[PDB]
Design a protein around this ligand. Structure first.
Ligand SMILES: Nc1nc2c(ncn2[C@@H]2O[C@H](COP(=O)(O)OP(=O)(O)O)[C@@H](O)[C@H]2O)c(=O)[nH]1
Ligand SMILES: Nc1nc2c(ncn2[C@@H]2O[C@H](COP(=O)(O)OP(=O)(O)O)[C@@H](O)[C@H]2O)c(=O)[nH]1
Ligand SMILES: Nc1nc2c(ncn2[C@@H]2O[C@H](COP(=O)(O)OP(=O)(O)O)[C@@H](O)[C@H]2O)c(=O)[nH]1
Ligand SMILES: [Zn+2]
Ligand SMILES: [Zn+2]
Ligand SMILES: [Zn+2]
Ligand SMILES: [Zn+2]
Ligand SMILES: [Zn+2]
Ligand SMILES: [Zn+2]
Ligand SMILES: [Zn+2]
Ligand SMILES: [Zn+2]
Lengths: 176, 179, 178
């Protein structure tokens, strides 16, 4: 059994909690959603226990220090594919955070809310603000920029790509 | 979108946790009840614009709670809860909970919430209270206590049957958005 | 109504969280299990009213910022070990009994053997034999309970719901009827 600690980081409202709830319980939350999902684990794969940690705000101001204690093995940096602000924060904030608190450990870059990237209403609302969803090549390029071992897109709502995210988190630690 | 932090305070066993679980999940708990419901939030639309309503349950007195839920981060509105069928919980609104909110959340609105409305005018809860020379708290008494502590509203509800529950949280938002 | 604080302690992976989930919800968890079930209580009638508060734990008390064994005061503790992990059984004497004695002196202990469903699962017994191990027997468990001064020894399975209700019934009785 190899234990692994996987922490999910990123801006508020990108879908970190929903990612974890959908994957761990196969249910998508209702309108009231936990702010921070509790720590869960599974024994999966080869012999592996995958420990999953949700986060609140920036590590430095979180009394629980989920990114630092105990030691993190792999980080999922999440941004919403329909929030360009949240993508820019990968570079401004989240890659710096993981490098600072978890130096020399693998990062997976995860674009969330894949289902909304072709949602008519979502695209229109963005267009009204002179914005457009983040594309696959853009995400891939950000992943290369920050030294992420994988770029993955998913929807917690439809579960498209969701299983691959957590399989790759494990592979990043087991098969570096 | 304005974020609103709403904290639920009051004596043990008044129904704070059940108030939150019933509202957020539309189910009333079974035999085993969490002591303190985790933090949940919702994106709500109120007369035009998006609000995120964050709900916090509490354990005991703030000063001895290492989590300090009433203080961190800053609370926008407090629900002081007492059970309509526990006069002692009601007296503690004046002895404990109003002083607590005034101390830790100065100059923020209070809603006074009478819980367990489904028991107030009965099951023969009335007869069991009478054995002890006690009587359920009446609406006028609750209203008077709300005035005394400067609460912006007094509301009665049942988590069990959901009587009046949605109004509690609608009014909590309105107290912050419409001071 | 008497409030009772019951804390569940023992090695990682013995089945503490599952014990608590299965009992309180009558169903065994999926592949994804909370590391530490949140604090729950129930109002229960035993003989002539009790509130039984249940606390799950993580690692050793002294390094757990939450200090569940110490704060507030514990009335009874369940020391758990897996019937198919001899190492976890040895840690009853090396670790868990000393922990409860240090942080909760002069309070009752119930010793609980978990994963009773495996004590005869061939995949498990054979794999144990390969490592020169054998599942813990009832007499061994009983002897350890005597050694550590536990007021009861109980065996259970969260997976099948064998013996679960008895664990919590006896937890109550240990405080109510000392
Ligand atoms: N359409 C869609 N909405 C999502 C998805 N994941 C999260 N959301 C919504 O995005 C908002 C924030 O989700 P949450 O998981 O609480 O984000 P967090 O702050 O990063 O934890 C909520 O309104 C969710 O319902 C998704 O995959 N698809
Ligand atoms: N009849 C009735 N009982 C309730 C109601 N809400 C809570 N309770 C019960 O009151 C007890 C305490 O509830 P809880 O929510 O845990 O109280 P807290 O300590 O204030 O969180 C439990 O036995 C609940 O079942 C209600 O609306 N009606
Ligand atoms: N076969 C069997 N497995 C169990 C039982 N209880 C827990 N487990 C498994 O043992 C592992 C650890 O359980 P958990 O409750 O998380 O252990 P804890 O670390 O002590 O809380 C998980 O793989 C569970 O599915 C049981 O009664 N029987
Ligand atoms: Zn969240
Ligand atoms: Zn930092
Ligand atoms: Zn438009
Ligand atoms: Zn509660
Ligand atoms: Zn929790
Ligand atoms: Zn105070
Ligand atoms: Zn556990
Ligand atoms: Zn210790």
């Amino acid at each position: 059994m190899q234990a692994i600690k996987c922490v999910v980081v990123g801006d508020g409202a990108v879908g970190k909690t929903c990612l974890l709830i959908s994957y761990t319980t196969n249910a998508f939350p209702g309108e009231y959603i936990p702010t921070v999902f509790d720590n869960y684990s599974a024994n999966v794969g080869k012999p592996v226990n995958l420990g999953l940690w949700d986060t609140a705000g920036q590590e430095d101001y979180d009394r629980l220090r989920p990114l630092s204690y105990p030691q993190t093995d792999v980080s999922l940096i999440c941004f919403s594919l329909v929030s360009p602000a949240s993508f820019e924060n990968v570079r401004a904030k989240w890659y710096p955070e993981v490098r600072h608190h978890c130096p020399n450990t693998p990062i997976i870059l995860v674009g969330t809310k894949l289902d909304l990237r072709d949602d008519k209403d979502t695209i229109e609302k963005l267009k009204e603000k002179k914005l457009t969803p983040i594309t696959y090549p853009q995400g891939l390029a950000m992943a290369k920029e920050i030294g992420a071992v994988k770029y993955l897109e998913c929807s917690a709502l439809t579960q498209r790509g969701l299983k691959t995210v957590f399989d790759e988190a494990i592979r990043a630690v087991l098969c570096p």
